[PDB]
Amino acid sequence: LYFQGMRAILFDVFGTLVDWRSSLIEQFQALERELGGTLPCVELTDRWRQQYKPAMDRVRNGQAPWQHLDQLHRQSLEALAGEFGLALDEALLQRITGFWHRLRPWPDTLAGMHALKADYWLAALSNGNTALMLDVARHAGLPWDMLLCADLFGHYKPDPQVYLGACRLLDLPPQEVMLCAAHNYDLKAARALGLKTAFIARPLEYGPGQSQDLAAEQDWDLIASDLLDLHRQLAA
């Protein structure tokens, strides 16, 4: 009842709800134990997360044709298995690319989603393609009403088509939809299209080094410490 119009909460998923960095590191180390000796887990994980952007913006700007996030993960992984000089059979490239499909939830994510679902539709709003988000959902137990991913719309966030398409599929005006995210760039794009905004800081997403998105950069509608606290603030 904090608004009363607001009926759906869209969520960003990577970083906001799941700790991709820990999960990838962990999966790299299980691999190093199976292969012969050491792999550079941290450096691979951290570089991979940045490597596809030029290629994502490439897609955005029309420079290159549509590829979904699984494909960009595949590409970028090949490019730096090169640089870093590990050779990979197709069976391994497929396996490593699918690392992003099994990601650990933050301690609050599950409980908070189960709390919020009573009063609100919950939907994923991810750059992850639908099939990748289905696997992430099942591994972590995320209780989605719907998944509204980039590949439904042929755009990556923050293209306005993503937010607008989500609201179109939910059959809601923007002002009745809230985006919850850990990243101010996402919230900034949603606000400009009339969406409500809830920010949850995830200061460990990028590890002990993290410098970005430590705090709210605008007066988002709700600022919450975690998803259950978002639920508390929403019900009052």
Question: What is the side-by-side order of every strand in the sheet holding 146-147?
Answer: 146-147, 121-124, 8-11, 177-181, 196-200, 222-224
Return the residues of window 163-202 that contact a copy of itself according to CB under 8 A.
Answer: 169-172
Beta carbon of residue 147, minimum distance to a copy of itself (angstroms, whole number)? 6
Residue 140 near residue 104 (C-beta atoms within 8 A): yes
Using CB under 8 A, pick the residue from 42, 134, 193, 201 that binds a copy of itself: 134
Location of structure tokens 């179109």 = 168
Q: How far is CA 117 from CA 155, 183, 206, in A?
A: 27, 22, 28
Q: What is the dihedral of CA 207, 208, 212, 213, to 10 degrees?
A: 80
Is 93 a residue that touches a copy of itself (CB under 8 A)? no
Binding pattern for the stretch 102-131 against Cl ion, x by CB under 5 A and - elsewhere: ------------------------x-----
Question: What's the angle, vertex CA 10, arms to CA 97 and CA 98, rounded to 5?
Answer: 10
Location of structure tokens 């289905």 = 134
Return the residues of window 44-83 that contact a copy of itself according to CB under 8 A.
Answer: 68, 70
Residue count at the site for a copy of itself (CB under 8 A)? 18
Beta carbon of residue 69, minimum distance to Cl ion (angstroms, whole number)? 9
Using CB under 5 A, pick the residue from 6, 8, 9, 13 that binds Cl ion: 13
Using CB under 8 A, pick the residue from 84, 107, 138, 218 that binds a copy of itself: 138
Phi and psi (nearest 5°) for 44?
Answer: -60, -55
Is 43 a residue that touches a copy of itself (CB under 8 A)? no
The contact set with a copy of itself (CB under 8 A) reads 68, 70, 121, 129-131, 134, 137-138, 145-147, 151-152, 169-172
The contact set with Na ion (CB under 5 A) reads 51
